[PDB]
Amino acid sequence: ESNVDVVSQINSLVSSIVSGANVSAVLLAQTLVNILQILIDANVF
Amino acid sequence: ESNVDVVSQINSLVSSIVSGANVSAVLLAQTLVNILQILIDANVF
Amino acid sequence: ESNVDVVSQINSLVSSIVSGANVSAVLLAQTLVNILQILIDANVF
Amino acid sequence: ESNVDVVSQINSLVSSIVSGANVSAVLLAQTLVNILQILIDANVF
Amino acid sequence: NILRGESLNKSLPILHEWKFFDYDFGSDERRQDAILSGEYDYKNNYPSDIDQWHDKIFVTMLRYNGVPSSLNVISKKVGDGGPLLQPYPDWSFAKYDDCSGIVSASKLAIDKCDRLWVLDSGLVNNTQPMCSPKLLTFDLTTSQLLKQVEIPHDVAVNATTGKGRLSSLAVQSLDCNTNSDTMVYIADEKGEGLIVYHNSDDSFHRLTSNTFDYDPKFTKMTIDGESYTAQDGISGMALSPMTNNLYYSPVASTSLYYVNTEQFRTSDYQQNDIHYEGVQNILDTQSSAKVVSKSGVLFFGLVGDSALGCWNEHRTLERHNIRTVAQSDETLQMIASMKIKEALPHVPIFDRYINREYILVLSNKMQKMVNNDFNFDDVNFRIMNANVNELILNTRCENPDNDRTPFKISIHL
Amino acid sequence: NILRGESLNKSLPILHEWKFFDYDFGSDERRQDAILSGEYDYKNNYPSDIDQWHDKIFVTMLRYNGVPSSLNVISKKVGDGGPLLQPYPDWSFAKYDDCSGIVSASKLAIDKCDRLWVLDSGLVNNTQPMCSPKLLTFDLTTSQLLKQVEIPHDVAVNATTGKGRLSSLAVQSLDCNTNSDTMVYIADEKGEGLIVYHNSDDSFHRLTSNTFDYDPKFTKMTIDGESYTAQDGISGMALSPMTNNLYYSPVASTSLYYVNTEQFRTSDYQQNDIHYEGVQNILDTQSSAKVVSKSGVLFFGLVGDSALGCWNEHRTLERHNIRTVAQSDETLQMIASMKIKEALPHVPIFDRYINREYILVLSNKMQKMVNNDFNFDDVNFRIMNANVNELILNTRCENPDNDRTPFKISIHL
Amino acid sequence: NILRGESLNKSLPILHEWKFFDYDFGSDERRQDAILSGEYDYKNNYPSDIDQWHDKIFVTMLRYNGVPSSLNVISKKVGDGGPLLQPYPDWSFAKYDDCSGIVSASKLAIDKCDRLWVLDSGLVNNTQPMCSPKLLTFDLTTSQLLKQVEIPHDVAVNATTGKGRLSSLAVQSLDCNTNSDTMVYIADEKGEGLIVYHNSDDSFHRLTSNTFDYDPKFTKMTIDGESYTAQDGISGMALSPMTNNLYYSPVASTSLYYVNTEQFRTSDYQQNDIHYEGVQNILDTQSSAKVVSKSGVLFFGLVGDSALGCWNEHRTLERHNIRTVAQSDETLQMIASMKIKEALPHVPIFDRYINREYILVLSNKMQKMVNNDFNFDDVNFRIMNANVNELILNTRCENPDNDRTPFKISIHL
Amino acid sequence: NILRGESLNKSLPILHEWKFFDYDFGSDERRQDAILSGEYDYKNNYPSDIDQWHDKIFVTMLRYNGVPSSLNVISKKVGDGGPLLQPYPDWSFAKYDDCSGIVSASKLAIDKCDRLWVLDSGLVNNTQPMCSPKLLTFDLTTSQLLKQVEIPHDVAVNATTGKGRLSSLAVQSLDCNTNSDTMVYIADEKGEGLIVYHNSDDSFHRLTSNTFDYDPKFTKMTIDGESYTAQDGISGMALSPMTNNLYYSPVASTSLYYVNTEQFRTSDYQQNDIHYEGVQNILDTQSSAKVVSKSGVLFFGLVGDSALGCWNEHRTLERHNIRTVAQSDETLQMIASMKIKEALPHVPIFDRYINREYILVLSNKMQKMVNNDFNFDDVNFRIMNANVNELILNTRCENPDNDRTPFKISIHL
Ligand SMILES: *[C@@H]1O[C@H](CO)[C@@H](O[C@@H]2O[C@H](CO)[C@@H](O[C@@H]3O[C@H](CO)[C@@H](O)[C@H](O)[C@@H]3O)[C@H](O)[C@H]2NC(C)=O)[C@H](O)[C@H]1NC(C)=O
Ligand SMILES: *[C@@H]1O[C@H](CO)[C@@H](O[C@@H]2O[C@H](CO)[C@@H](O[C@@H]3O[C@H](CO)[C@@H](O)[C@H](O)[C@@H]3O)[C@H](O)[C@H]2NC(C)=O)[C@H](O)[C@H]1NC(C)=O
Ligand SMILES: C=C(CC[C@@H](C)[C@H]1CC[C@H]2[C@@H]3CC=C4C[C@@H](O)CC[C@]4(C)[C@H]3CC[C@]12C)C(C)C
Ligand SMILES: C=C(CC[C@@H](C)[C@H]1CC[C@H]2[C@@H]3CC=C4C[C@@H](O)CC[C@]4(C)[C@H]3CC[C@]12C)C(C)C
Ligand SMILES: C=C(CC[C@@H](C)[C@H]1CC[C@H]2[C@@H]3CC=C4C[C@@H](O)CC[C@]4(C)[C@H]3CC[C@]12C)C(C)C
Ligand SMILES: C=C(CC[C@@H](C)[C@H]1CC[C@H]2[C@@H]3CC=C4C[C@@H](O)CC[C@]4(C)[C@H]3CC[C@]12C)C(C)C
Ligand SMILES: *[C@@H]1O[C@H](CO)[C@@H](O)[C@H](O)[C@H]1NC(C)=O
C-alpha cells in the first residue's frame, strides 16, 4: 500500500466518521491494518 | 506475507504464549496485522 | 457484570458466529469489553 | 469508573505517550476498556 | 460386539427440547380461538424432519387433524411447554384447504445454493392421500416460493398395489451454478420404490427392486421395551459427497445396501441394469435415519438398541468395523432426522485449526405415537448437537489424523 | 487385551529430535579444542531426564568420560545433528573435578514454587561412585543455587550389599508458602530402597521392603527385538496430586504397587508399619516411567510392547481397565521421562473452555546403549508432546465429561 | 481597521468546486435528449443555498428556463465540469409544470429533529410569480414529504406595492419533542417584510418596519471591481441559539439590527410593539449572509471587500470589536450561504478534547450573474469548509479559552 | 504596539509549581538531620534552568550555602510545598567539597544524541569562584558521566578586569554520528565574552566585541513594580536550526544581535573578522531568555513588561513584526529558561496531522531574589507548557499554513 494511498484512505475514513454516515467495516479494518503496518515499520512498539 | 509464513508465525506465537514466556509486542502486532489482512481478503466483515 | 453472565454472553456470541447470522456490533463490543476486563483482573498483561 | 477518573487516566496516558516513556500495558488496556465502555453507553455502535 | 462399552449411557448436548408443541398464533386470545375452532390440538403434533439455516430451525409436522401448519420455524418466544413455532413463511401457505399451500411436509434438504427443498407427502393422517405430492423450492434469502413441481401419479404409487407414501428425500447437485443440475431422489416405503427427478430434464423415473421390499421377519420393532409392528420399504437415504453413493436400508430389515449415482447419469435409465451393492444382515437392529459427513463417515440410528452407530467408508463394510458411539434409552428413543453442517464463515487457511463438522439429531418417541401413549408431562421431543471429530475420535470410525498444529478447536452449535 | 487396536502404529508430534548431541561451546575452534582434549565425545552422550520452564528445556546427561556437562538447557542455535545444548547456568557448575559442580544429574523436578530440584547420582559410568550424592535447589528466576544438601552414606546404600544408585526423584509440597514443607522421595534401584527427606526437619530416612526388590524371572527386557538383561529395583515414582499416592514398580517385575504419603506425615517413621498396596502381575511387560495428571489419570510406559498405557484412578485397578493409547516401535523405543504440564497464564473463569494439560515424553534407545550399538545416522533421541484429554478421549481412561460450552480448545506445545 | 492585516489573501479549504453544473440524467443519450428538448442548459444554473446531512450535500438552483430541478443532492458520479447533481428525492418533484413539485427552492434549513425545511419562492426568473409559495417539511430518514403548507397571498406581498419575493428562511424550535413547536421566520426583501409562521397554530403573521426598508444610497455594490445595482430589503437572517436573537441587515445598507424572539412568544402580536435593536452604519460594506455558532460568534460576509467578518456576542457591538478572518478576492466573490455544523457522534465526556463546530460557505459570483458575464472555463462556484475555533483563535472574536487538556483535536469536513 | 491587545492577562497551563523547594532525603529523620546540620535551607534554593527527557524534569539550583544538590530531577513523591526533588544521578555527585561533583550547574542542554550537557559555573553565591568551571557530558540512558572537560582560566575570565561568570550554554551538532562534531558556545556576562569549544579539536577560543558589553543606561530593571540594578553582558543564546544563527542580547540593553556559526567553521578563528549583525533598540524592555523552534520562530522574554514575545525569521526584523503572545504579571515574573521539544515517537507520515512542537517555560521571581523579599506562602516558582502553533496562530509570527487535512491535533505536555 502506497503512503499517499494510506493518507487518502485515512482522510476519507475520518471524513465519513465525522459526517455521521454508516462507516463500512471492511474499510475501517483495512485502514487499521495499514496504520498498524506503518507503526510497525517505524519500530513504535 | 506468504500463507505458510503466516501459519508459522501463528504457530510460534501460540507456542510462546502457552509456554509462559514474555511475548514480544512487535511479533504480536505483526501476527495481528497478518490475521486481519487474511480475514479482510476472505470478506469476513 | 457477573461471571455467569459473561459466560452466557460468550456462549451466545460464539453460537451466533458459527451459525452464520449477522452478529450485532454492540453485542460483540460488550463481549470484548467483558473479556478484556476479566483478563485485566487476572493480571495477564 | 467515575467520569473524572476516566478523564484523569486519559490525560495521564496521553502525557506518558507524548513524553516518550515506556507506557505500561495494563494502564493502556484499562484506559481502552474505559473508553470502549463509555462509547457503548453512548450508543456509538 | 457392535455396542461399544464406553458408549453406554452416553448422551448428547441438548440444543432444544419440548414437552409438547405450541404455536405462536400471536395474542393469547388468538390461541384460545384456534383451540376452540379445533385448528390446534397439542395431542396431534409430531416432528418429522429438522433443518438449520444461519439462525433458523425448520421443523416439519405430519398433517393430522389438529395441526395448524406443517412446516414451522423456531421463534424467539418461549412457551411453557417449549419454544414457540411460527408458520413459514406466513399463514398463507399454512392454509392447505385449497391445496395451494403445503399439505404435509415430509422431509427437508438444503443445498449449497441456499435453497430449501420441501417434499409434500400429500397424505393426511399418513394413510389418506388428499392432494398430489409436490416438490417445492424456496429461496431462503428472499423467503419466496421459487419453484413448484407436481409428481405424476403413476410414478408415485405402484400400479399393482395402488398404495404409496413418500418417505425420504435426498438432493444431489453435480453443479449448483446459474443452472443447477440437481438430481432429486425420493424413496417411498409404502410403494417400495425410488423416484429420480432430473431438474434440467423435468423428468421423473421410477425404479423398483427386490432390495427395496421389506422382510416380514423383522417387522416388529421394540423401542424402550414397547413393541410395535410396521411394514415399510426403503427409507433413510444418505448421499455420500466423497463417493457419490446413495445408501439405504428397508425399515423392516437389517441389511444395508447402496447404489452409485453415476449409473443414473445416463439418460437411458435401462431397467434391471442398475446394480445395487449391499450386505445382508450386518446389524442386530434396524436403521432409522442415516447421514454421511464430507470426511467419509456414515452415521445411522439403531432403533432396537436405541443407539447411534458409525461406519468409515474407507474401511471395509463388515460387522467388525461397525461400532456405536452414543447409547441412551431415554435421550435417544427414535432417531427421525440427522443433518451434518459445518461452521461458518469458511476460511480456507484456518481449516487446519478447526474441526468444522457438527451433527444435529432429532429424537421423537415414535413407539408412543404408534400406541397413542404420550406422557405430555415429560420431555418427549429433543434436538441434540454434537461434534463429529470428537464423537468418533479414538474409535474404529476415525479417519487417519495428523496433529500438525499446536492447538485444535472443536465447534458445535 | 491391554493393547488397543486403534492405538497400533499411532505416533506423537515431535517437538525436537537429535541424531546425536552437540554442545554450544561457542566458536568452532573452541569445539575443535574440546574434541581434541577429549572433553567432548558424541558417542558418550545419553539423555536421562527432561523438564520445561517457560521457554527452557532442561536435559540431563549421564556423566560418562566424554560428557562436557551433565545438565544442559536447549539453546536457540541449531547444529547439523540437532539443536545445540548450553551448560546451565554456566561452565562453572560443569567442572565436576572439584566436585563443587554437578557430577551427574539423574532426574529433575519442578514445583509450583518455581524452583528446580536436581538429584546428583554421584556415580560416573553409572557403576563407579566418585563423589557424594547431592540434592540441589535452584531458583529458575535468578539462576542461582539456592540450596545444596548432601545425602548421608548410610541411607544412600545398603549396609549389607554395599551398593546403591539413586534412580528416581519425586517432590511433594504440602504447602509451598514462605516456608516450603517439601518431602522429597528418592528411589534407589541398586539399593532397592526409598529415601524420604524432610526439608523442614533436614532429615533423611531410609525404608526397605520386599516389594522394592526385583524379580529374577523378569530381568530380561526385549526392545525392538534386541534383548538386554538388567537387575534393578524400584524406579519410576509418580505422585498423584489428587490422592497423594506414590506409585512404583520394580524394573525387573510387572507388579504395580503404591503407598500413601499420609503415613509419612508422622515423625515416628515406625519401621515395618508402612502398608504398601499393590497388585501382582497386572502387566504383560515392565513399566519404565510413570506420571499422574491432576485429573487423576496415570500414564506408564510398556517397555516390552514399546507403548504408552493409561489407568484411571477413579476406576478399579485391574487388567480390564488398563488400556494403551500410543503404540509405535520406532517412535517410542524406551520411555525414560514423562512430565505433565499445563497451559499458562492461568485464568480461573476460562478453564471450562480449554483443556490445559499436555504431556512431554522423552524417548531414547536404551537397548542400544546397553549393547553399544548406536546408528548415529538416524534419529536416536526424540521429545514428543501430546494433549492428555484428546489422547484419552473415548477410552476406558477418560474421566466423566460434560460438554457445557459451544467450543472446546485443546492446547499442547 | 476592520480588515485585519493577517487575514489578507487567506483562503479556505475547498470541499467541492464546479466550472459549471451538470446533472446525472443517467445515460449519455438521456442527457443529449434533455439538452435537445431545452430542459437542461448549462448557462442558466446558479446555486442559491447549500446544506449537509450525514453524507448528503443539498444544493438549491434558482428556477430559470433551463433548470432541470430546483433542489439536487450531490451524487458520487463526477462529470468533467464538476460532481454530478441528482434530483431529490426523484424526478417526480422536479416536474413543476403541475406545481405539485417544487417550483423554486430558495433556502434550506435543518433542525435537530432530522427534518428538512424547504422554502419555495414560487418566482420563476426571480421576477415572475408563477405558483404560490410553499413551506415543505421532508423526513431525511425516509425521504418522504412529511408536510406542505401554502403561504397566504396577503402576507406574502405588500398590499400597496404589490410585489414581494421571499429571500431568507430561519427555523427555531423551542422544543422538538413529539410535537415540534417551531416558529419559522421568512424574510422577503422585495416586500421588505417578515413572516412569522407558528407550526402549532398554523398561523402566518406579517410584520413591517422602517428598518426592513432599503437605503437608496448604498444600492450600488462592487464585487471584484465590477459594480451592479440592486434594491432589496431585509435578507440574511441568523438566529442565535444562545441569546435567541434574530439578526438581520438590509441588502442595500450597512446598518445591522436584531430582534428578540421572546417578543413573538405572545399570541397577541401587538403591532408597532416589536422593539428592534440595532446600530446604524457599523460596516464599510454590505452583509450578504450571516450565521451564529452555538458558542456565541456571528459570522457575516462583507460583499464590497469580499471577506468574512466575525463578531462576539458577549463583547459590545462596535466597529472596534468587529474584525475580519478571511480575505480573498477570487476564492470568496459573493457569499450566498453559510451553515455551521458539529462533529458526530456526540459524546458528552470527550467534548473537552474536540473542537466540534465547522463552517461551510458557498461562494458564487453574483456580479457575473447580474451582468450575464460568466467564464465557464474557470471555477465559478465553490464550497469551502473551515474550523471555527482555529479560524477565530487569537483574535477579538475568540471566546475565553482554558487549556485544561494535554491534547486538542480540530475537526472539519 | 509590540504589546498585543488580546495577549493581555493571558496565561499558560501550569505543569508544576512550588511554594518552595524540598528535597527527597528519604526518611523524615534524615531531612531533620540535614536541616540541623545546615546542609538544607528552604530560603536559599532558586531555580536556574530546566530540561525534560522522556519522563524526567531536570532542574538546576544555584549553589548557595544551604543547597543540598545543584542538579536535581523531579521525583514522584510530592511534599507540602511542592513535588520533591531527587539528586541526580546520586548523592556522590552532590558532594562538591572535593570538587569532584558538580559545584554549581548553570544551564542545561540536550542534543539529539540523547546526551546531557551540563555547564558548571564554579561560582558559589554567584560571586565567589571556588573551583574551575567544567563541561560535563552524561549519558541519559545509562546515567553515567561520559566525559568531563575543564575550561582554561585565561579564556574563562578577562585578563584586564579579572572577573567572569558563565551565564549561557548552547550546543550545536553538525553531525551527531559515532563521532559527534559538536561546537559548544558559552556566553559569560561578567566577562562580556563568548567561548567556542570544539569537541573534536578539544580547543577553547575566546571572542569579545563591543556588542557583548552592557549599556549603563538600561541597567535598571523593573519587575512587577520592584526595581533592581544589574550589570551583565551577553546572555540568553538561542541557536536557530534552520538558519544556523546564534542570537543574543546584552542583559543591560534592548538591542538584539546575531552571528552566523558558519564563520566559526574555519579553524583560523581570525580576530576582529567575525561580523555580528544586529538591530539597536528594537525592544522597549530587556530580553531574558530566547529559544528558536525548528519552524523558524524565535521566542524571547520581555522582563520589563513581563511578557513573551515572538519574531518570525522569514519576515524582516523590525518593531512592526515583533509581537507579544502571552502577558501576565503574576504568572510570568521573570523568564529564566525556555525549551522547545517535540512529540514522540516520530512518525514521518503522520507529521501532517499533528503539531508536534511544545514549549516549556520556567518562571522564577528574580527581583525577589535580588532584594531578598520572598513570600514562601505563595507560589513563587512555576513551570508552564504551551503549544507553539496554537500560541502563534493568527498573528504576525505565524508561518504560511495549508489546511490539507480534515483534522489537526495539537500536542503539549
Ligand atoms: C537391602 O536391605 C534391606 C533391609 O534394609 C533388604 O530388605 C529386605 O529384603 C528381604 C528380602 O530380600 C525381605 O524379606 C522378605 O520379607 C517379607 C515380609 O516382609 C517375606 O514375605 C519374604 O518372604 C522375605 O522374607 C525383608 O523384609 C526386607 N526388609 C524389610 C525391612 O522389609 C534388601 O533385601 C537389601 N537389598 C538386597 C539387594 O538384598
Ligand atoms: C410595505 O408595507 C409596509 C407596511 O405594512 C411599509 O412599512 C412602512 O414603511 C414606512 C417607510 O416606507 C415606515 O415609515 C417610517 O416610520 C418610522 C417610524 O417607525 C419613521 O421614523 C420614518 O420616518 C418613516 O416615516 C412605516 O413605519 C412602515 N410601517 C410600519 C408598520 O412600520 C413598507 O414601506 C412597504 N414597502 C414599500 C416598498 O413601500
Ligand atoms: C477464546 C476465546 C474467544 C473465542 C474465539 C477467539 C474463538 C472461539 C471460536 C473460534 C471461531 C470458530 C469458527 C471460526 C470459523 C472459521 O471459518 C474462522 C475462524 C473462526 C471464526 C474461529 C475464530 C476464533 C474463535 C471465535 C475466549 C472466550 C476464551
Ligand atoms: C483462533 C485464532 C487465534 C488463536 C487465539 C485466539 C486462541 C488460540 C490459543 C488460545 C489461548 C490458549 C491458552 C490460553 C491460556 C488461558 O489461561 C487463557 C486463554 C488462552 C490465552 C487462549 C486465548 C485464545 C487463544 C490465544 C486464529 C489463529 C484462527
Ligand atoms: C490519529 C490517528 C487516528 C485518528 C483518530 C484516532 C482520531 C482522529 C479524529 C478523531 C475523532 C473526531 C471526532 C470524534 C467524534 C466525538 O464525538 C467522539 C470522538 C471522535 C470519534 C474522535 C475519535 C478519535 C479520532 C477518530 C492516525 C491517523 C494518526
Ligand atoms: C481521541 C481519543 C484517543 C486519543 C488518541 C487516539 C490520540 C490523542 C493523542 C494522539 C497521539 C499524539 C502523538 C502521536 C505521536 C506521533 O508520532 C504518532 C501519532 C500519535 C501517537 C497520536 C496518536 C493518536 C493519539 C494517541 C479519545 C481520548 C477521545
Ligand atoms: C445414566 O446416567 C444418569 C446420570 O448420572 C443416571 O441418572 C442414570 O441412572 C444412568 N443410567 C443407568 C442405566 O444407570
PDB file of N, CA, C and O in Angstrom, chain G residues 298-327:
ATOM      1  N   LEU G 298     -20.952  35.426  15.691  1.00  0.00           N
ATOM      2  CA  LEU G 298     -21.702  35.688  14.471  1.00  0.00           C
ATOM      3  C   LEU G 298     -20.726  35.942  13.330  1.00  0.00           C
ATOM      4  O   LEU G 298     -19.842  36.798  13.443  1.00  0.00           O
ATOM      5  N   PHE G 299     -20.888  35.200  12.237  1.00  0.00           N
ATOM      6  CA  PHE G 299     -20.085  35.353  11.031  1.00  0.00           C
ATOM      7  C   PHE G 299     -20.961  35.947   9.939  1.00  0.00           C
ATOM      8  O   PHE G 299     -22.089  35.486   9.724  1.00  0.00           O
ATOM      9  N   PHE G 300     -20.441  36.959   9.252  1.00  0.00           N
ATOM     10  CA  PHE G 300     -21.132  37.614   8.152  1.00  0.00           C
ATOM     11  C   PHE G 300     -20.178  37.803   6.979  1.00  0.00           C
ATOM     12  O   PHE G 300     -18.957  37.689   7.124  1.00  0.00           O
ATOM     13  N   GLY G 301     -20.747  38.082   5.809  1.00  0.00           N
ATOM     14  CA  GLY G 301     -19.953  38.241   4.606  1.00  0.00           C
ATOM     15  C   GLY G 301     -19.924  39.655   4.062  1.00  0.00           C
ATOM     16  O   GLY G 301     -20.957  40.190   3.649  1.00  0.00           O
ATOM     17  N   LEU G 302     -18.743  40.268   4.054  1.00  0.00           N
ATOM     18  CA  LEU G 302     -18.571  41.607   3.508  1.00  0.00           C
ATOM     19  C   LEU G 302     -18.473  41.519   1.991  1.00  0.00           C
ATOM     20  O   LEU G 302     -17.465  41.042   1.454  1.00  0.00           O
ATOM     21  N   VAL G 303     -19.526  41.974   1.306  1.00  0.00           N
ATOM     22  CA  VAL G 303     -19.592  41.844  -0.148  1.00  0.00           C
ATOM     23  C   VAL G 303     -18.582  42.761  -0.822  1.00  0.00           C
ATOM     24  O   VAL G 303     -17.845  42.341  -1.723  1.00  0.00           O
ATOM     25  N   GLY G 304     -18.535  44.024  -0.405  1.00  0.00           N
ATOM     26  CA  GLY G 304     -17.681  45.003  -1.050  1.00  0.00           C
ATOM     27  C   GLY G 304     -16.206  44.679  -0.946  1.00  0.00           C
ATOM     28  O   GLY G 304     -15.474  44.752  -1.938  1.00  0.00           O
ATOM     29  N   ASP G 305     -15.760  44.314   0.251  1.00  0.00           N
ATOM     30  CA  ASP G 305     -14.377  43.911   0.466  1.00  0.00           C
ATOM     31  C   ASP G 305     -14.142  42.441   0.140  1.00  0.00           C
ATOM     32  O   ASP G 305     -12.987  42.000   0.151  1.00  0.00           O
ATOM     33  N   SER G 306     -15.205  41.688  -0.156  1.00  0.00           N
ATOM     34  CA  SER G 306     -15.104  40.265  -0.464  1.00  0.00           C
ATOM     35  C   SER G 306     -14.394  39.521   0.658  1.00  0.00           C
ATOM     36  O   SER G 306     -13.344  38.907   0.437  1.00  0.00           O
ATOM     37  N   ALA G 307     -14.954  39.566   1.865  1.00  0.00           N
ATOM     38  CA  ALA G 307     -14.272  38.997   3.018  1.00  0.00           C
ATOM     39  C   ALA G 307     -15.290  38.387   3.967  1.00  0.00           C
ATOM     40  O   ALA G 307     -16.501  38.490   3.760  1.00  0.00           O
ATOM     41  N   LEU G 308     -14.776  37.753   5.015  1.00  0.00           N
ATOM     42  CA  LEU G 308     -15.587  37.152   6.063  1.00  0.00           C
ATOM     43  C   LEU G 308     -15.269  37.832   7.388  1.00  0.00           C
ATOM     44  O   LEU G 308     -14.110  37.858   7.813  1.00  0.00           O
ATOM     45  N   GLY G 309     -16.294  38.380   8.035  1.00  0.00           N
ATOM     46  CA  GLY G 309     -16.108  39.047   9.307  1.00  0.00           C
ATOM     47  C   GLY G 309     -16.812  38.339  10.446  1.00  0.00           C
ATOM     48  O   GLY G 309     -17.778  37.604  10.223  1.00  0.00           O
ATOM     49  N   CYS G 310     -16.340  38.554  11.671  1.00  0.00           N
ATOM     50  CA  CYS G 310     -16.897  37.902  12.845  1.00  0.00           C
ATOM     51  C   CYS G 310     -17.121  38.921  13.951  1.00  0.00           C
ATOM     52  O   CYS G 310     -16.467  39.967  14.001  1.00  0.00           O
ATOM     53  N   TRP G 311     -18.059  38.601  14.839  1.00  0.00           N
ATOM     54  CA  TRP G 311     -18.356  39.434  16.000  1.00  0.00           C
ATOM     55  C   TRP G 311     -18.781  38.540  17.153  1.00  0.00           C
ATOM     56  O   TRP G 311     -19.620  37.651  16.977  1.00  0.00           O
ATOM     57  N   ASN G 312     -18.204  38.773  18.328  1.00  0.00           N
ATOM     58  CA  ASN G 312     -18.566  38.003  19.510  1.00  0.00           C
ATOM     59  C   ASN G 312     -19.753  38.645  20.216  1.00  0.00           C
ATOM     60  O   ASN G 312     -19.760  39.851  20.480  1.00  0.00           O
ATOM     61  N   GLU G 313     -20.761  37.826  20.522  1.00  0.00           N
ATOM     62  CA  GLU G 313     -21.976  38.349  21.141  1.00  0.00           C
ATOM     63  C   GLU G 313     -21.713  38.853  22.554  1.00  0.00           C
ATOM     64  O   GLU G 313     -22.334  39.825  22.998  1.00  0.00           O
ATOM     65  N   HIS G 314     -20.806  38.196  23.281  1.00  0.00           N
ATOM     66  CA  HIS G 314     -20.520  38.613  24.650  1.00  0.00           C
ATOM     67  C   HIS G 314     -19.948  40.024  24.689  1.00  0.00           C
ATOM     68  O   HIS G 314     -20.307  40.824  25.561  1.00  0.00           O
ATOM     69  N   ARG G 315     -19.060  40.349  23.755  1.00  0.00           N
ATOM     70  CA  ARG G 315     -18.472  41.678  23.714  1.00  0.00           C
ATOM     71  C   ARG G 315     -19.437  42.673  23.074  1.00  0.00           C
ATOM     72  O   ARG G 315     -20.392  42.303  22.385  1.00  0.00           O
ATOM     73  N   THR G 316     -19.176  43.954  23.319  1.00  0.00           N
ATOM     74  CA  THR G 316     -20.053  45.014  22.846  1.00  0.00           C
ATOM     75  C   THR G 316     -20.029  45.104  21.322  1.00  0.00           C
ATOM     76  O   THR G 316     -19.048  44.752  20.662  1.00  0.00           O
ATOM     77  N   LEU G 317     -21.135  45.590  20.765  1.00  0.00           N
ATOM     78  CA  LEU G 317     -21.291  45.724  19.321  1.00  0.00           C
ATOM     79  C   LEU G 317     -20.768  47.091  18.896  1.00  0.00           C
ATOM     80  O   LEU G 317     -21.404  48.117  19.159  1.00  0.00           O
ATOM     81  N   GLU G 318     -19.612  47.103  18.239  1.00  0.00           N
ATOM     82  CA  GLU G 318     -18.999  48.338  17.773  1.00  0.00           C
ATOM     83  C   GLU G 318     -17.998  47.995  16.680  1.00  0.00           C
ATOM     84  O   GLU G 318     -17.637  46.832  16.484  1.00  0.00           O
ATOM     85  N   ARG G 319     -17.552  49.031  15.965  1.00  0.00           N
ATOM     86  CA  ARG G 319     -16.573  48.827  14.903  1.00  0.00           C
ATOM     87  C   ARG G 319     -15.244  48.325  15.451  1.00  0.00           C
ATOM     88  O   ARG G 319     -14.497  47.645  14.737  1.00  0.00           O
ATOM     89  N   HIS G 320     -14.930  48.651  16.705  1.00  0.00           N
ATOM     90  CA  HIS G 320     -13.674  48.204  17.300  1.00  0.00           C
ATOM     91  C   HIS G 320     -13.638  46.686  17.441  1.00  0.00           C
ATOM     92  O   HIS G 320     -12.612  46.050  17.173  1.00  0.00           O
ATOM     93  N   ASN G 321     -14.754  46.088  17.866  1.00  0.00           N
ATOM     94  CA  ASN G 321     -14.777  44.647  18.097  1.00  0.00           C
ATOM     95  C   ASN G 321     -14.874  43.868  16.790  1.00  0.00           C
ATOM     96  O   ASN G 321     -14.351  42.751  16.689  1.00  0.00           O
ATOM     97  N   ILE G 322     -15.541  44.430  15.781  1.00  0.00           N
ATOM     98  CA  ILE G 322     -15.741  43.716  14.526  1.00  0.00           C
ATOM     99  C   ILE G 322     -14.412  43.581  13.794  1.00  0.00           C
ATOM    100  O   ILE G 322     -13.705  44.571  13.568  1.00  0.00           O
ATOM    101  N   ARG G 323     -14.071  42.350  13.417  1.00  0.00           N
ATOM    102  CA  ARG G 323     -12.824  42.066  12.721  1.00  0.00           C
ATOM    103  C   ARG G 323     -13.079  41.026  11.641  1.00  0.00           C
ATOM    104  O   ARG G 323     -14.070  40.293  11.679  1.00  0.00           O
ATOM    105  N   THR G 324     -12.169  40.971  10.674  1.00  0.00           N
ATOM    106  CA  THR G 324     -12.243  40.012   9.583  1.00  0.00           C
ATOM    107  C   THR G 324     -11.287  38.852   9.832  1.00  0.00           C
ATOM    108  O   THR G 324     -10.257  39.001  10.494  1.00  0.00           O
ATOM    109  N   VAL G 325     -11.638  37.690   9.288  1.00  0.00           N
ATOM    110  CA  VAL G 325     -10.849  36.480   9.448  1.00  0.00           C
ATOM    111  C   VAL G 325     -10.299  35.983   8.116  1.00  0.00           C
ATOM    112  O   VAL G 325      -9.138  35.577   8.036  1.00  0.00           O
ATOM    113  N   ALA G 326     -11.110  36.013   7.060  1.00  0.00           N
ATOM    114  CA  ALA G 326     -10.712  35.511   5.751  1.00  0.00           C
ATOM    115  C   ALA G 326     -10.899  36.612   4.721  1.00  0.00           C
ATOM    116  O   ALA G 326     -11.954  37.254   4.678  1.00  0.00           O
ATOM    117  N   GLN G 327      -9.878  36.833   3.898  1.00  0.00           N
ATOM    118  CA  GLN G 327      -9.915  37.829   2.835  1.00  0.00           C
ATOM    119  C   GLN G 327      -9.358  37.208   1.563  1.00  0.00           C
ATOM    120  O   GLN G 327      -8.213  36.744   1.550  1.00  0.00           O
TER     121      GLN G 327
END
